[PDB]
Amino acid sequence: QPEPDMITIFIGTWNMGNAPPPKKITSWFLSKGQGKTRDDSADYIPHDIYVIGTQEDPLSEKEWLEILKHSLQEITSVTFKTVAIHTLWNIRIVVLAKPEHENRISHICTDNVKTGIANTLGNKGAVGVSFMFNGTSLGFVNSHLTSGSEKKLRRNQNYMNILRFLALGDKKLSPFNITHRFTHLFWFGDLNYRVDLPTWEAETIIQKIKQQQYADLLSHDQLLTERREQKVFLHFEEEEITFAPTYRFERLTRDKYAYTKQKATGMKYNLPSWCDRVLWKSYPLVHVVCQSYGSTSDIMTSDHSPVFATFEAGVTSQFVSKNGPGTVDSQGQIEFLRCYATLKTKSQTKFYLEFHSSCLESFVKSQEGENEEGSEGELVVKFGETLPKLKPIISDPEYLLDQHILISIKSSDSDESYGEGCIALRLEATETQLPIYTPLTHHGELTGHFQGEIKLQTSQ
Ligand SMILES: CC(C)(CO)NC(=O)c1cccc(Cl)c1
Numbered sequence: 001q002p003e004p005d006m007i008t009i010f011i012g013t014w015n016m017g018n019a020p021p022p023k024k025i026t027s028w029f030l031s032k033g034q035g036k037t038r039d040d041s042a043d044y045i046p047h048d049i050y051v052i053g054t055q056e057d058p059l060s061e062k063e064w065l066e067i068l069k070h071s072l073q074e075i076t077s078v079t080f081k082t083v084a085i086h087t088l089w090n091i092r093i094v095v096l097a098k099p100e101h102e103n104r105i106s107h108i109c110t111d112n113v114k115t116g117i118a119n120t121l122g123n124k125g126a127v128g129v130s131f132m133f134n135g136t137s138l139g140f141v142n143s144h145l146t147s148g149s150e151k152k153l154r155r156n157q158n159y160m161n162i163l164r165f166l167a168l169g170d171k172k173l174s175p176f177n178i179t180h181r182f183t184h185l186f187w188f189g190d191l192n193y194r195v196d197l198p199t200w201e202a203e204t205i206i207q208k209i210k211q212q213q214y215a216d217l218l219s220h221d222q223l224l225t226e227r228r229e230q231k232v233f234l235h236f237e238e239e240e241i242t243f244a245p246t247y248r249f250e251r252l253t254r255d256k257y258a259y260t261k262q263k264a265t266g267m268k269y270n271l272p273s274w275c276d277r278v279l280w281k282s283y284p285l286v287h288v289v290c291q292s293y294g295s296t297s298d299i300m301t302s303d304h305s306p307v308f309a310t311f312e313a314g315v316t317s318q319f320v321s322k323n324g325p326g327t328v329d330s331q332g333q334i335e336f337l338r339c340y341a342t343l344k345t346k347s348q349t350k351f352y353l354e355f356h357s358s359c360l361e362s363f364v365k366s367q368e369g370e371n372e373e374g375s376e377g378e379l380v381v382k383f384g385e386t387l388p389k390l391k392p393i394i395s396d397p398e399y400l401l402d403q404h405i406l407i408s409i410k411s412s413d414s415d416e417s418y419g420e421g422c423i424a425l426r427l428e429a430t431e432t433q434l435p436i437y438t439p440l441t442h443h444g445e446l447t448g449h450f451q452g453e454i455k456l457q458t459s460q
Pocket of ligand 1: 082083102103106
């Protein structure tokens with residue numbers, strides 16, 4: 001039975017509005033309704049992994065697992081295994097997988113982060129799951145961020161707290177937050193970003209939605225504008241939105257947006273918005289293709305419509321050679337030449353690098369680099385040809401070319417990371433000096449750049 005090189009992943013996000021679901025929700029798992037939908041000819045084909053994020057979920061874990069498992073069984077005739085389930089208040093993530101994947105899945109982690117302080121600590125935050133699928137690390141984050149058209153900054157703050165404090169993936173990757181720990185990271189939820197147009201334009205917005213004319217609305221979507229200004233979700237992707245706003249509907253129909261201020265809304269307008277979103281971030285040069293991104297039309301128990309997204313995702317096998325794992329393979333080496341970090345920091349400490357990768361027995365500390373002044377005020381840390389030669393566990397190019405090196409630049413004074421990034425070993429050539437590059441982030445904010453050249457030796 002051959003190990004897969006590709007899997008399909010279903011991501012669902014639904015704010016249930018504290019109401020039980022209707023008896024049939026199969027349209028969600030089938031990617032049917034509005035937007036980029038799945039072909040009818042695929043309806044009996046199960047996804048490998050289903051990740052279900054809910055918000056304002058009134059159900060017990062047991063109640064929701066029974067609905068989900070019985071829904072997928074009806075669609076696919078397959079009885080899914082429960083990988084993980086985690087609930088913070090009314091925020092829930094469920095991971096289900098086809099039975100053939102049970103013994104490919106290991107290192108399951110779950111966590112939550114509560115956002116806000118005092119007043120604003122009460123019901124918003126995130127849940128997450130991570131695990132290994134053969135040689136591939138997968139992370140999933142379901143977040144319910146701060147509500148309200150006038151709180152986009154609060155939402156960006158919630159995002160930064162979630163990505164700093166959510167403890168998923170390999171704890172040995174200690175300088176790295178969840179935005180560097182996974183081959184593929186999926187971040188979805190009721191992110192609560194609004195269409196930022198005047199209240200007086202509500203009926204105009206509804207008109208535009210009825211004509212399926214979204215361009216002038218999406219140009220005012222707070223998540224798209226905040227992302228474009230690098231305020232939030234830096235280095236994340238999102239598929240083009242081609243479905244109507246998923247909030248705020250009158251319940252029991254989809255014919256009406258309920259946007260007017262009411263006691264129940266704290267006298268706030270809820271102009272039609274794309275609250276409910278799916279984004280991802282994969283390591284460089286790993287296959288990831290969005291095959292669907294849309295909303296259901298036929299599930300009307302909530303004031304939100306469910307959103308679906310499906311992905312093809314590249315995965316690798318567990319790899320065993322004569323040598324590694326358990327030793328190095330002297331026919332392999334990674335050399336970094338003429339490397340320098342450019343940092344936005346105004347500080348003056350020395351810096352060194354750490355290299356982390358599952359292709360190494362353990363992480364490698366470099367010598368301190370040489371600080372120079374950049375021509376436009378910047379700190380440039382020069383490593384030259386001084387960086388340690390990295391000794392991979394396996395030299396076979398079918399393994400090594402699929403790997404990644406995580407880089408942290410750390411202060412000699414504090415040992416705190418000032419920047420994190422990732423270099424793919426999927427090179428155009430081996431035994432050849434080739435340019436490499438990664439932006440560097442810390443707490444998911446741009447702090448600089450790492451660039452230079454790499455020379456990769458494999459057994460071929
Ligand atoms: C018992 C739970 C629900 C805990 O998260 N699931 C597992 O432990 C598990 C482990 C390996 C593979 C798979 Cl499919 C599930």
